[PDB]
Design a protein around this ligand. Structure first.
Ligand SMILES: Nc1ncnc2c1ncn2[C@@H]1O[C@H](COP(=O)(O)OP(=O)(O)OP(=O)(O)O)[C@@H](O)[C@H]1O
Ligand SMILES: Nc1ncnc2c1ncn2[C@@H]1O[C@H](COP(=O)(O)OP(=O)(O)OP(=O)(O)O)[C@@H](O)[C@H]1O
Ligand SMILES: [Mg+2]
Ligand SMILES: [Mg+2]
Lengths: 553, 24, 348
């Protein structure tokens, strides 16, 4: 029924004046004298409720309904396939007004295959001819891939309804509708559930409800397991893991549940267990790096927490002062200074979806597939907004368009430039680029709308290295007073963040050599001491020999 | 009718990299 | 495209069997649809009829809401499901005006646009640029045969910092001379199908003469495809502007990122520097952003520090001030103050 499908208020508004009206109020069109050749097409992400909606609407309109499944058209003969189609468009005309639902039209509208499309397209013209023009016949087609349709058919479907993905207000309606016949607690905040399910569709929200129901029965399974244990005194307790025993215990009886209700804590657990269909492929795991792993870089942190982390958490607070919820940032500086570190901290501290591109990872040897990967990269970034796109070592993906560029990477630079233009100010996509050679990256990528924000990550100062060395040593376990002396030592003049990490590793290795000799003069716990830092400072040199090169770009 | 497995063609059209030479 | 007079027949032909009204005159909605075509006026009729049928639906809901005292769209389906008549109305000329705005002309997908509404009042400064424009592009449009006296017988070039009204200048030029305007981006043209789009742009312009072709970021189209796009463009920049009135305007950052053959006597003429707005212009540029979300604006911006900041660069100043505005909010625990701007002038 209509009550069972929610969150489609915009879609149900168009279907009222484009499907319902020329099926029940055709007399007004007859008085107006206007033929209805509108072919209504339903398209959107898979799982948005196209098939279910088209059957709930069909049952509500009340006119004759002819469900058509594309695989069921084929009967076993080349000529029999047209017989099934010719028995549909004739029946609808004979029983006008009528509704035709061509579910999964692209399965037979992408020999026998080339003749079904011709029969389908001719059958729509007969609808316009063999009708009183006051009893319209509407053909409704649903497909999640509108681009696979034959242009001879998609041209005949003037009305196209893009359901799209539900918004926060719409997802709240779906969640309330799904949890309508269930027993619920009082802590369930459906508005909070809608906030933390971005990129979800109706099917994904159905899994979240389904996941929470299983959690509500977890307590009813442990009690069932305990009864089996009490019946078998110490059975299969050796050489069998606990999960294996649980299957064996429940397999024994197979012959012999209190009605509890779902709480709010189980709904939060359910959301984590459910991976939305938009995130099944193409998304990277959230990095384990936090802001506690990033030492100093307060200036870079403030810019990142005000352009990316900020707008994601409070999209309304920032938009009041003219801060749009979308940014393009080009981190640049000498190598080893933390461009990738802060980008991994932003991806983890923003709680948003993350896509990482490792240099020229999108290039493909076939024609067009290299550019389609770039376009598909921004297609799934929009569907899972907010999303952070991190282009690491971006100088290899958008090189300077010199004479020595070939007509293969230029076609990718142009595609990437256009996709960055298509990213709106309120889209929710935050693109981060990192490169240590800004003189090899195209100057067209730094225009506004594109990566027009540049953040320079450079070598730490003497006071800055103290924060970084304390950060590195803290996350691996000398105290803290000695760390200031080590980092402020003049031998660390050009040390970057990586060099300080190399310095700590050298001290750790120097400890083990001392430990190895320590255990030979006693036999015959390793702790990094201050004397280990003394010989680590001597044998570690800065990696960035000429820092001026990396900042003169 | 019997459905048959048929052999067909493809477009492919791979793109290859090249090496150039420069003057002094 | 169909002429303004010719569109009257198309509007009348489609509405031949439609119940129209005396207020519907097929001249008002014709002059308001310059770029609309037969496939576009077809949807204009469809929208107006559906808009007219919207009254028959809203009234029907009122006839059903009274009987029976879940969002509104879901309630509408349930109310009409119980019933399972309709007064015959007529299309109102007011609805036709609204249906025109609802229906998007198909020329936008192709980049074609009608005569722009932007004039030189919207842009700032350019007191010397305007003098040169009234003889290179604007000049030889209003006077197709006056320039023959001096024996002159194809477009100019624009360059400067980005976001400094170079697109706005081209739109204003097409308005002064009352000519069509086609703005086509460089990378968008690049598709071996990037050469057909070059001829298509000129062919559409010729059929809709007079017109102006604006190739923003033209350096991305013909930098120096190497001998295909740059060769097809040359063949179209020769026979243009003599007896057609078309003049191609190109935009870039510097007048060296485009091919030498493009910049020659006969295809492209002078090169005009656009950018670095004056103090008077920057008053309205800063107020442009603040309008959406006047004392400090004419003070904090007209100083000696916000001189080289271009229009694109001026947006950073507000954003940096906005970032410091929220910094003050957090330290005291959404309004931009003067103390927010002082700590933002020197960081941009
Ligand atoms: N808005 C919604 N409200 C309630 N349930 C929904 C909604 N959207 C989808 N569902 C549920 O999720 C599932 C969607 O299946 P359905 O066949 O309708 O998807 P579809 O849009 O046709 O996509 P596809 O054909 O690609 O699978 C059903 O179980 C349906 O009950
Ligand atoms: N500010 C910092 N605080 C703590 N550790 C740091 C810092 N900067 C760098 N490091 C250490 O150096 C390692 C390498 O730095 P990172 O890879 O982030 O530099 P980068 O700018 O990405 O260099 P490249 O240009 O070579 O990719 C980090 O994983 C971390 O161990
Ligand atoms: Mg379906
Ligand atoms: Mg890196």
């Amino acid at each position: 029924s209509i009550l069972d499908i929610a969150g489609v208020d915009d879609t149900l508004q168009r279907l009222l004046k484009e499907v319902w009206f020329p099926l029940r109020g055709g007399e007004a069109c007859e008085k107006m004298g206007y033929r209805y050749d509108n072919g209504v097409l339903l398209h959107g992400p898979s799982g948005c409720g196209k098939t279910t909606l088209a059957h709930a609407i069909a049952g509500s309109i009340g006119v004759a309904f002819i469900p058509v499944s594309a695989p069921s058209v084929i009967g076993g003969t080349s000529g029999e396939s047209e017989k099934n189609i010719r028995d549909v468009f004739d029946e609808a005309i004979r029983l006008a007004p009528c509704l035709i639902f061509l579910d999964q039209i692209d399965a037979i509208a992408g020999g026998m295959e080339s003749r079904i499309v011709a029969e389908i397209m001719n059958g729509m013209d007969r609808i316009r001819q063999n009708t009183p023009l006051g009893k319209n016949v509407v053909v409704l087609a649903a497909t999640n891939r509108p681009e696979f349709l034959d242009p001879a058919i998609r041209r005949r479907f003037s009305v196209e309804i893009d359901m799209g993905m539900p918004s926060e207000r719409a997802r709240e309606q779906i969640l309330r509708s799904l949890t309508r016949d269930l027993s619920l607690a009082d802590d369930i905040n459906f508005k909070e559930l809608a906030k933390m399910t971005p990129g979800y569709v109706g099917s994904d929200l159905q899994y979240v409800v389904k996941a929470a129901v299983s959690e509500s029965f977890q307590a009813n399974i442990d009690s069932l397991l305990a009864q089996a244990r009490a019946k078998h005194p110490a059975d299969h307790l050796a050489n069998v893991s606990q999960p294996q025993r649980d299957w064996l215990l429940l397999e024994a009886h197979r012959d012999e549940w209190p009605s509890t209700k779902i709480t709010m804590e189980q709904f939060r657990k359910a959301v984590s267990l459910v991976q939305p269909a938009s995130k099944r492929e193409g998304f990277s795991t959230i990095p384990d790096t936090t802001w506690s792993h990033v030492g100093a870089l307060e200036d870079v942190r403030k810019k990142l927490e005000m352009s990316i982390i900020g707008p994601i958490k409070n999209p309304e607070l920032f938009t009041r002062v003219g801060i749009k919820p979308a940014a393009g940032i080009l981190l640049w500086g000498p190598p080893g200074c933390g461009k990738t570190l802060v980008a991994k901290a932003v991806a983890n501290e923003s709680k948003a979806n993350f896509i990482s591109i490792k240099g020229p990872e999108l290039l493909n040897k076939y024609v067009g597939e290299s550019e389609r990967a770039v376009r598909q990269l921004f297609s799934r970034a929009k569907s899972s907004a907010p999303c952070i796109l991190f282009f690491d070592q971006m100088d290899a993906l958008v090189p300077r368009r010199d004479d020595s560029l070939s007509d293969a990477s230029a076609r990718v630079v142009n595609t990437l430039l256009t996709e960055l233009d298509g990213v709106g100010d309120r889209s929710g996509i935050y693109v981060i680029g990192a490169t240590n050679r800004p003189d090899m990256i195209d100057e067209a990528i730094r225009r506004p709308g594109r990566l027009g924000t540049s953040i320079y990550v450079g070598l730490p100062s003497a006071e800055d290295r103290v924060k970084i060395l304390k950060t590195l040593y803290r996350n691996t376990v000398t105290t803290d007073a000695d760390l200031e002396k080590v980092a402020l030592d003049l031998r660390c003049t050009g040390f970057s963040g990586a060099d300080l990490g190399n310095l700590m590793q050298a001290a750790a290795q120097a400890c083990l050599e001392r430990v190895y000799t320590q255990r030979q003069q006693k036999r015959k716990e390793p702790v990094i001491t201050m004397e280990d830092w003394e010989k680590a400072l001597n044998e570690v040199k800065p990696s960035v020999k000429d820092p001026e090169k990396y900042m003169h770009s | 009718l019997l459905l048959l497995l048929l052999l067909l063609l493809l477009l492919l059209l791979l793109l290859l990299l090249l090496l150039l030479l420069l003057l002094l």
